[PDB]
Write a protein that binds this ligand. Structure first.
Ligand SMILES: COc1ccc(-c2cc(NC(=O)Nc3cc(C(C)(C)C)nn3-c3ccc(C)cc3)[nH]n2)c(C)c1
Length: 263
């Protein structure tokens, strides 16, 4: 559905692979104003690329998870626009950086559990994310985070998020649900560190050497010891020793309940 007259473009959000992404306002039947992200596609693209761009809307319309980004609509007629629901609080990493003096550890464990639930759903359909990081998570409200996949490296030199990747992904470009588990724990380290970048003290080329020797990201200051134990299991060199997301949901819910009881 959705007529173009209902959508007003306001400012450029950023540059996507296929074209610019705009911040906008969608007015529905009730006259309610919904903040939106409007994804565009270059007119001179190949039919194959126009198909790949539109495939996001065809796929995303089937996703209705509370912790996954929401598709509002698609305007098929040229210029073809994909209309995503905008989360004005923005990316979680920047949000954590701004609110570091008021955020409680229970809230950081809550966000980790919400993303784990989103990943447990993707795991159930044998899909891989391959870019799990705090920059791909949006804050719908202080009580709800939403997982997206909108990085310029994208259903599933560098370019690649080396500092978040498993050793099999860095060495052989192997990406499995087990490699997503490794990346997810790197994302949890970013959350518990209030948006710090993993391995900020190294260059990309030093990462593999450090991992092969047995070194790992240190426990963030406010990270509960039991949560850090779970992160280290996700960082096992052997992918078969990493937990599945479905079981990690159970372990994270246990940590959340443990933290709530103390709080
Ligand atoms: C500030 O508020 C904002 C609101 C929304 C956005 C935003 C979201 C997206 N799209 C997106 O996240 N797609 C997605 C998610 C996933 C899983 C389900 C998480 C894996 N898969 N794919 C996917 C991508 C491409 C293809 C072909 C198929 C699927 N673009 N922009 C932004 C930037 C800001």
């Amino acid at each position: 559905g959705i007529a173009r007259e209902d959508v007003v473009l306001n400012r450029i959000l950023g540059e996507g692979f296929f074209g610019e992404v705009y911040e906008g306002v969608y007015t529905n039947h009730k006259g309610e104003k919904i903040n939106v992200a409007v994804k565009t596609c270059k007119k001179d693209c190949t039919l194959d690329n126009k198909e790949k761009f539109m495939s996001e809307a065809v796929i995303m319309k089937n996703l209705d998870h509370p912790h996954i980004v929401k598709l509002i609509g698609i305007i098929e007629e040229e210029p073809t626009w994909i209309i995503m629901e905008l989360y004005p609080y923005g990316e979680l990493g920047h949000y954590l950086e701004r609110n570091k003096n008021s955020l409680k550890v229970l809230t950081l464990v809550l966000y980790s559990l919400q993303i784990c639930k989103a990943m447990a759903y993707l795991e159930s359909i044998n899909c891989v994310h391959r870019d799990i990081a705090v920059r791909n998570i949006l804050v719908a409200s202080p009580e709800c985070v939403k997982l997206g996949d909108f990085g310029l490296s994208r259903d599933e030199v560098t370019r690649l998020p080396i500092k978040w990747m498993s050793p099999e992904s860095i060495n052989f470009r192997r990406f499995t649900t087990a490699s997503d588990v490794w990346m997810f724990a790197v994302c949890m380290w970013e959350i518990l560190s209030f948006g710090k970048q993993p391995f900020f003290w190294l260059e990309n080329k030093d990462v593999i050497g450090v991992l092969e020797k047995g070194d790992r990201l240190p426990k963030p200051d406010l990270c509960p010891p039991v949560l850090y134990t779970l992160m280290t299991r996700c960082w096992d060199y052997d992918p078969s020793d990493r937990p599945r997301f479905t079981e990690l949901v159970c372990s994270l819910s246990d940590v959340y309940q443990m933290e709530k009881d103390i709080a």
